[PDB]
RNA sequence: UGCGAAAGCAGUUGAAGACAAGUCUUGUCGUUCGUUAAAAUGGCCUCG
């Protein structure tokens, strides 16, 4: 977080989804808007062992949702689509090594 | 009677070898129609090894 | 034996005070004690009376040399424990506590007692050795 | 409301739910508005097997009301938690606790349920898959549970240290949701 | 005081339940059809048909053969056609059964690998067969009953097809042994005919192979529910072929799946002996298309092989069975909260044991093997082994006991028994008439003469054929749908007077010497037991509703029946198990003994009685002095050896471990 | 004698502190 | 000593009858075999005592129908009786030693 | 130990100190004595159960194949 | 429950009210007065 010491936090807990994930090496951070409350918070996305994508709360680290694709997950990216004033949706784009998106 | 049991086992043979050419016994076609279709042994055994698997902890 | 068993059975039915006399009779033997309990004590009322009589006597004098009164209670407990605890009489429970307390002393007494038997078996052999 | 036995308020503080003997009936009401006004007997939620079994099965030890008001969790002395959909009174049984559950609290979004009891272990129930995360070997049994944050950043927990029968020894713990480590004891 | 011989040296073991199938598609709005039935597959090849009305009573039983089983059961219910049943025997054959006779109507070779799965389409005109070679075979049945034709072959693949499900008449969904679900297109007039549009892979066990045991389609929300070996349940979007939700719920294999009519509830079961409830009733869940695991319940002591569901305006049934060999019934709407019934393992609708008062002989016939015991303490005087693969349907022993007749659907054989050295010498009497004769039922008139009812219901007398005329039965729509109801179910011969009862409730008195038939009764309920009493000159008939009827043999009904039929004791009415056996009391002719699977009762017919949930509500029509004891159970058979002697015959596997916590 | 009695009373204190396949019967009706 | 601890662990956990509920002679004989030997040891004798009391109280009926369990238990009566003697002479030695001083 | 003390009892009395030089004997003995009270309780219960229970086709085989063959 | 040492020594449990079940008889109490006075198949993280 952001000089005598460094405020560093260590994320370790997948909440029952430890099998799907073998490492945090590939990850990205995106913004998620909770439409029901209109609140916005950060989310950490991870790459799973078998087409799995794990989504974590940026601060609380809580396992929010997970996405699955067929084949080996190779890469993913995030696109945002505005809806209205103050309203936007986050889209996860994931691809297989073959090319299915 | 173990002696006769072997004799019955010898009796129930549909296959014998004469000369250079094997020979096989024919059952009557009408009889085969009457008999039910029966089971395969492997399909049940494939289940059985699955039913007795360690993961099941049938114990 | 058969006569005394019938007499004891009659006294149990008659609520006679001579039940204690029947129980302490010397004609009784251990297999007969088992036989009488199994076959003649069929009512909870008779079982309670025999236990009450035996318990009161043993409570009064736990140091009686007559092994018979204790001899009865052994199999009465062993063979009819399920029926005995089934008895819900308050007085029966009180007598059990009184018997339990009267017995309770003796077990405290024995460890001291055995060592003092040792001191005597000790003192003998020197006296015998000194004699020799 | 009369003969109120048990009462609770939503995390936002705008919905109340309470149980009364008018055996028992649970009713929920919106506070500043008339939007929510529902009531139903406890027997409807209670199972027939629960009715056959002892009163511990029928005895409620905790209750939580979701912020929006669709889900109401009821705990039981047996350790059973039942989440009820108020729209259709459909029941869902979540039971890991072996003893009476002492604290229940819904998450802000409602996707998660915080539970605590005699086990001295905090249970985070993940409702979409019903998974469970655990915080064991706490200092004392759990009296209360709450999620405190705009984003649920911290959890406030209440310990009893019931070992001391002479006095009730309350200890207040604030835990970081990020790593679930003691932020303030 | 009256002697009882409580015997358990006779042992019968039901075959494990393998497949379950309801006869009708659930319709909550409509009332329960009169013809609703449940078919049960057994590991010994027997198919059991049961009626959910009047609690549960077994209408008819199809007898299996040696080394035979039923791995899949499938019904076809076309409007205006007779109900059709299809079974798979673990081989490359699909068997259609003649319900009228209980014999194989048609045997069809799939021309492919060993069959693993069977399923029928929405229009009910096609069958899909899953094969060991990974080929899926499409079979047309619309031609007619007994008519089976090869339609089309879906692409051969290398993984075993363990299960099949349909999407209307357009697609075939199949679970495979490679841990991979396959969707094939069945749309005719489509270039993608038979094409494999999408194929999904489940999560695979690291150190074990993964098998997709069960797959079910969900029309309301249009997904596929799949259970595999790993114990996980996955929900998949059909149109995109993508995983929606996963539930790592079962600790062992998920073998079977089922859903409610509205697709609001998905039920799973398997080795772990638990039935898991998945819910989407809540409107927000429906809007969000998210399922919720409501609850689970442990009801079986062993594996749950088969699960099936039925609903109607008056019916709401969840029926389960498996290795435990017993049926468990629950309400779909109230699975978590509703009561349950565990059906008895053996309900002796058909008597497989007999007792001879003379010579004190007890004869039991299981799996083409007949064992004879003598009671004086019991000695197995004789045991008989039969060659034919077909199991013994019935055995009849002469009053003297010298002549024993063994009956099978294929053949009937007569064996004479001679007592030598406290043992019975067996000699097979040769009778060509009986050998080529099918024997559904067989009773002795005397030591010599016999009455035999054929599988075609041709009644004749054999002296050791004098055919007996039978009244014609008017055809009914229920009879057309279910053929066997009009067939003879109970025959009884008593002092030259023969009584036959059909499943439709028609009872007729037959005079064997006159060989003429006279109608006796036409009851509205299935007849479970019949008895003839010569001393009172009346016939006792018991319906499926456990009502006792006494008819004078020519008032049509006896005065006792007129006064006591609706005035039976509370015990008789409260019974959920129907009466199956009646036998007289030697000491007093008027007294009669009645026993069921778990109860025995005696009623004096000279004394009038003081006047003072899990079954169909039965709004619709079925078609179109006192001693009671339950201490003995389960009861195989009950009867008298002598005037004061009673014979009671009673019944005397590793499983998934689920510890019971104790404190 | 005391030792014997005390061990005995110990035993008494500790005492205080502490289907067939075929059956043959003849039932009433 | 490791054997004594785990038995000492279960008792203090209050799990003795719990550990002995689902057992038959086949899995009960190993329990007694050590008890046949543990009674001799001073340290384990009291621990052996507690576990034998419960199983007798919990498996009295099975003992009647199980012959082998009897012989396992008959030899226990002999050995436990021998230990009674050994302690009895010890007490005799203690008092006389006390007499010497 | 008993015979050692029995024969030399007089000699042992005429010793300046015994407990320090025989501390191990007393400690070792003391442990054994503590077994006696409990161990009696076990014999009783052990005796209780002991007294309780202590007082408490081929020949006829017929086969059709075998008869048919001979 | 009281005293006492740990051992133990003494004593204690009643009146209602409400409801559930049978069919007048029984049970229960998130209810009162008075007396020193077992059991819904449900076990405790990640951080190698």
CSV table of C-alpha atoms (C1' of nucleotides) in Angstrom, one decimal, chain D residues 18-21 23-27 39-48 50 57-60 74, chain I residues 30:
chain,number,residue,atom,x,y,z
D,18,UNK,CA,-38.0,-10.2,15.3
D,19,UNK,CA,-39.7,-13.3,16.6
D,20,UNK,CA,-42.8,-13.4,18.9
D,21,UNK,CA,-45.1,-15.9,20.5
D,23,UNK,CA,-45.3,-21.7,18.9
D,24,UNK,CA,-43.5,-18.7,17.4
D,25,UNK,CA,-43.6,-16.4,14.4
D,26,UNK,CA,-41.0,-14.3,12.7
D,27,UNK,CA,-41.8,-10.9,11.2
D,39,UNK,CA,-44.6,-12.2,8.8
D,40,UNK,CA,-44.8,-16.0,9.0
D,41,UNK,CA,-45.0,-18.7,11.7
D,42,UNK,CA,-41.8,-20.4,12.7
D,43,UNK,CA,-43.4,-23.8,12.1
D,44,UNK,CA,-43.4,-23.3,8.4
D,45,UNK,CA,-39.7,-23.0,8.3
D,46,UNK,CA,-39.2,-25.7,10.9
D,47,UNK,CA,-38.8,-29.2,9.5
D,48,UNK,CA,-41.1,-32.2,10.3
D,50,UNK,CA,-37.1,-31.1,13.6
D,57,UNK,CA,-33.7,-28.7,17.1
D,58,UNK,CA,-36.6,-26.3,17.2
D,59,UNK,CA,-34.8,-23.7,19.5
D,60,UNK,CA,-33.3,-20.8,17.6
D,74,UNK,CA,-31.9,-18.7,11.5
I,30,G,C1',-37.7,-18.5,25.5
